[model samples]
Target: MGVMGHNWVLSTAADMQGVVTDGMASGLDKDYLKPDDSRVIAHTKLIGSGEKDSVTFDVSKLKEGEQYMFFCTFPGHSALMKGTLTLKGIPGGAECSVDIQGNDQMQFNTNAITVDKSCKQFTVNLSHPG
Candidate 1:
């Protein structure tokens, strides 16, 4: 909460125009972010100048190539406090993977993945087929 709980909205959105309502009405519990808002890719709870909050969500929430919106839901600040988050690639999702061969695939799994370069790590159960 910089500037003594400026009541700013600090959240991310899958879509830029998704903030239908400012989080002010929801208050701190919701951190000015609407509850269960699908557009919310990630968000932080309310904080004050004394306390700051940070959140880490799965890289999977982001697409292979997409841009996301980051803003504060605290009413008026959004116009001034907002930016974009682009998928340059995550440490775990883009570089490494393990395949499942029934139960044997478990052995193929690695211990950990790397996270770097404006990256956030998330444990993803790899599942994809086309």
Candidate 2:
């Protein structure tokens, strides 16, 4: 547990197994994810001890009765490290800020994104990675 690579993956409880299965088979280089996997609600990149990652998603994505879960996607790791996600007593999930990183190569980390109409406050944190 001390030396393993881990990530926080989110999805519906029913999709957890499928996400984990594909993610594990894809290898660490892929960050245990299949390209453009829609089932993934959000995820942090794989990191080792002392290293950390974070993910932010709109709370509007969650439904009142839907079952959500967060777990590690590392092979054979889910059985011990996994938990549920709930929206109990939360005021809002309408996060409207995005960090867009641009590099000298003239490319942006994310080419496109969707801003929910409900987000009255939208801002982009732009940075140059290069």
Candidate 3:
């Protein structure tokens, strides 16, 4: 779930209105998202700080050995909010797990993830570091 070509909703605090232009500091306007933006597999409607939204996908058709990702489309937010999706509770599963840490520094503690093949499915647990 990457951003749809970097187009996103601008925060009211950002002060600009309408649609934001690509590579511009203004907020995402109606023009934020582009046609067939590959980075965005899906998107949430415009949301502001303190607002919450959720989206669900049918992963039952997901293929083995394939990987998936999720991220925010809001400009400048992706550096802070992004994650991976892995399946859990398959037939034979591994006894292992993963821990991901996000910080206000706009960085994740780990950059690479490895899933043990012994497990039929894997679970990823993410935490925010204060």
Candidate 4:
């Protein structure tokens, strides 16, 4: 929202640094992305305040258990703006319930939750004990 521009670029965690490094050399005209770079699975155009963009990528390209990352390629923004993208489960698996607990210190018992793609309904049970 300031002088900086940003874009959402997706890549494997292993390729994040390389993608950002090459994007640095690609410049604004290319939306801070190296042209036709396969390492980039998908991305949105660079934008600033008042502008928005969307991207749609094939989910089949993401393998379960692999670490994926989405980040801004605008110079150093990835240091804080990057986040993980996960593929939870393949279609037709049955498990779809999660139980978690939190205490007074403000912590959840688990860092990750998984739901099967076939689930039309999912349940999350939370308990607070402190």
Highest TM-score scorer:
4
Name the 10 consecutive residues with the lowest summed lDDT in model 4.
99-108
Which clashing pairs does model 1 show? Answer: 1-48, 1-49, 9-72, 9-73, 9-74, 10-72, 23-32
TM-score of each: 0.55, 0.66, 0.41, 0.68
Backbone clashes, candidate 1: 7
lDDT (0 to 1) per candidate: 0.44, 0.64, 0.41, 0.67
Off by over 4 Å in 1: 1-14, 20-22, 89-130
lDDT of 4 by residue, 1-130 (tens): 3345667777899999999999989988898899999999877787654455566555566677888776778777666656676667665677655544433332335545444545544444444343
Cα lDDT of model 1 by residue, 36-123, tens digit:
7666765555454344344556666566545555555555555545555445545453532222110111121222223233444532
Which candidate ranks first by lDDT, i.e. highest?
A: 4
- Quality of model 4 by C-alpha lDDT: 0.67
Tens-digit lDDT track of model 2 for 21-63: 9998898788888767899987767765445455666657766
Write candidate 3's Cα lDDT for 1-45 as tens digits.
Answer: 432222122122122222222423433564244444433434444
Which residue pairs does candidate 2 place in steric collision? 23-32, 59-93
lDDT of 3: 0.41
